[model samples]
Each structure stands twice: as C-alpha cells, then as structure tokens.
Target: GMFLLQGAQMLQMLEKSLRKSLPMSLKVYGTVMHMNHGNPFNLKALVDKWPDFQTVVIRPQEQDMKDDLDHYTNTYHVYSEDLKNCQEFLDLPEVINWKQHLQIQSTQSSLNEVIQNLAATKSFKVKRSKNILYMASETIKELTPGKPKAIDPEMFKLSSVDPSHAAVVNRFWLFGGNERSLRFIERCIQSFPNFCLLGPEGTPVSWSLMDQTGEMRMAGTLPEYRAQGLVTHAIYQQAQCLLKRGFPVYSHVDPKNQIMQKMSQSLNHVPMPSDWNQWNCEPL
Candidate 1:
C-alpha cells in the first residue's frame, strides 16, 4: 500500500513550504518514487506518514513533526520548512532540543539559526556531518559492477539480515551501542531490503540497512574484512534492489570517508543533481 498520501499535489504542498530549501527535499523525492509503485512494507513505508506517529500536529507540515522524528532513533523524517524557526523554537523548546539525536540540514542561515536560537540554552552539543545524496541515474558510473577481485565469492555469501543475527549486527554498528540497535535492525529485516554478506563465520561480515528517510545507512563490514570489496558488493546489490522496487536507488555518504565515497561512485551512484546533501546532527 501507499504511504504518506503520495501525489504531486501533496508534494506541491510540501514543495511550496520548502521552495528555498533544495537538497533537503531529496528524501521526499525518493518518497514520490516508491509510493507511486505501492510499498510492500505497507504503512511502514514513510514519507508523509509523519502524522500517524502522533496527532499533536494537525497540519501535515509543522514544527511538531520534528517532535515526532527526533525521538525513537529518528523513526520518522520530518523535513517541513516550518520546523526549525523562531516561533517553533520558542513554542517547543524542550521538544526542539538539539540535545537529542537530530539531523539538521538546509541552508547555512537555517542551520545557523537553529544553533543560534538554541545557543542560549546550556548543555547542548552540536555536530556537523557532510554527505552526498545519490539517486538512480543513467549518467552514474558503475565502473566495477559486482563482486570484484578483492571479494572471494567462496569465502562470502550475501543475504538479508535476519532476527537471529541481530546481536551480531549490533556489535559492530557505531550507533548500535544499546538495545534499540538490535531491535531496530531486527524490525528492518522484516520490512526493508537491507543486504548482508555472510562470511565464513556464517554471520554477516558486511551489511547495509535502509532508513525511514527512504535511503540506506548503517553500512559496514566486520573489522577484519574491510577493504575486501565486500561493502561495495553490498552497496551495488542494495541499489539494484531499490531500483527494482521503482524507487530511485539512492544513499548518502560522508565526503570525508573517501573509500566509501569512491565505492559509491564505482557502483554508478552519482549525486542526483550534483549537490551534496548533508546530514547535520545535534546530540541530545
């Protein structure tokens, strides 16, 4: 079934609010794609589903949507134009706390305004993460298409992450230092097409998980298996899975992580419009 009331009309409503913000709307762009084909994950497929988690926000695009997403491991992606403003800040100071796990991205002014508005409050920490968002494009370069020389097919096999291996998935994840890490991946295994590589150990040696933002994240390989082209295989396979579902195969990568960036481009993942969409954060 469709999620988030998909339509150009609805997108138009959001586009109007976000007219000045460019790359921020990229996630919603993917929203339109997958929603059109009907999501297999049903209502779990998010885009405009922000309202369901909580009814506190009457309008589809409002500040309270942030209140919903910033919690629960960013369970929802609230990118409305109205969320990070003066009135929203003043109205919902506690709810708008930058102290929680938050992804903030837009213009420099908007980014600064959030930091400035919340600057008065003590005990908040801010962090900046730069990433390039990519979508399916004919122009992209899939230079090294599949399991390359570095990846030994006999030594590894690719498959979806299952609940039985949730503990193993949690062990290596940077954000998976807690219980929710296991629960989150376990649920994702049921709903999304997150690919994993089973090494000789019979557990995932490398993996990638799809996010509610309609993109991929939590991509990593077991420490010893790094640089074996395993992650690249996982990325290529995941992109193919997304593209087959009628959703643009897209994911964001840190510019600083040159290896991952090179890997993405190698799999023909180019920035949809050449703009590097960033994911900024404030720890709560």
Candidate 2:
C-alpha cells in the first residue's frame, strides 16, 4: 500500500501537502528541503498512495549494510494526517524491516499510542523514548548572544567543529559513542555548518553541529567551561550561518531542560505547541 516518490518533481508535489500540515510537518519539510537543495544524506520519500496519500515517510535509500553496528542509516521519520493509513505502511516489512534495529523520529503526538501498538504487534519493543521540544526561528534574521558571561568572550576563539573532534563528541553524545554514530557525527561536521570555541590549547571547549535534517543538535561544553557564554556564542554563530545558507533554523530541546529552553528563546527560537518524539525500537 506504499509507493516511492521519485524525482524532484514528485518531491515538490509532496511539499505542497507538507505545507498544509504546518508545525507537525516541519521535520519532514526540513528533510525534503535538504533533498531539493542537493540531498547529502541520499534519502528517499514514500507515501501511502501518492497524490491522495495521508502519510509520508523519509528514509535512506541504501539497503546493503556491511556492518550490523551501523544503525544510523536506518533512521525513519513519519508524518501522517490519517493514523490508520500510516499504520498500514509501517506494518509492511517491504517498507521497513521488523526484525532489525529501527530509529523512528516523529512529531505526530496523536500517533504515539498507535506506534507503540504497532511495535508490539510486530514483535518489536520500544527500546527508548526521547521527548523534546521542537523549536523554529524566523529565517533571515540577525542573531545576537543573549547574555554575556563573566569570562571575557575573547578567552575562546570561534572555529568550525573539526572532524577530528568527532571522537570526543561521540563519547558525550547521549545516543552516540558507537563506531557508526561517530561516523555520522564526522559526516555532519564535514557536511554542515557548525560552531565551536577553541580553548587555549586549540581544542574545542564548546561546540554545536547541525544534523542532516538541518536541526541544530549535539551541542556540548566542557564542565569547567559552562556559564562562560561559550555555548551562547556558538549557537548564535551556527544559527546565523544556517540563515545565510537559506536553511530553516531549528533545534530540539528537552522539555525538562529549562536552561536550554531559555537559551533557545534568547537566541530567538519559538517552541511549537507539540513536543517531538524519537522512538528507538528493535525486535524483542
């Protein structure tokens, strides 16, 4: 009950449906936007029945996996107007493999229970559930560091997140550290605009990277470097860079992380009413 959307023309047609979907469709739209702007992830789009469809799933096109540990490419994002129609596509192994690792990123709050039920039915269990705020900033706007820190801004130098720093970043990344995720992080550093502050030793003390979806993510700072305004500077720089590239500036924040929420606001990001969810699942 699912068909592939081939060529830029078809993707543009799909974009119209996404435009009608608004806040809930932002993530999918970001992916599609990236695809239209020269897809760096080599992703593909699928819909339940083309022009009359109610669900859209964006996933990688590659199938031959040389390493079982490489689960990053299996990531999936689903947006749907009709939950039942979405369920039909997800239930098919031809669209997704039930017995393998699956990482689902979704913003459809209404589809939460339905997805869990489907996982159970397919002998798959939800391994992890990460709920966060999806916020977007007005594009083509100037960004300023919200508040200055006690430490002088000159203490650190601005720089691109070096691909060499991927190992350290992977170790600290909540969901990464494995070989494959490290590879993914490295790719992001190489392919996207990122900002970091180098300490006296010329190593990153704070940094942020943009994911393939054009969302700002994997931001971190050294323990002693916190409260020094390094993160604020890095985020502001990255946000502005994305704006220059004509990207939709956005990022995810943990609901419980009020500090991050405040920072996002300080940098001009407004939270969507609905929370984003990333469901990590695998066969039981």
In model 1, the runs with Cα more than 4 Å from the true position are 1-22, 31-70, 74-76, 80-126, 139-152, 271-284
Clashes of 1: 4
Q: Best by TM-score, which number?
A: 2
Q: lDDT per residue, candidate 1, 72-157, as tens digits?
A: 34322334444343324323433334444554433222334445456456344555444566654531332112334457778999
Query: Tens digits of per-residue lDDT for model 2 on 1-284?
Result: 78998889998888767766756776787678778877787888988887978888888765544444366767887788888888888887766666667677766677687677797789877864555654545642322114334345467888877799999889878779788899989988887768899988888998988887777889888888777677777888887777677667777777677777777777767777666777777777
Candidate 2: pairs in clash: none
Per-model TM against the reference: 0.63, 0.88
Clashes of each: 4, 0
TM-score result, candidate 2: 0.88
lDDT of 2: 0.76
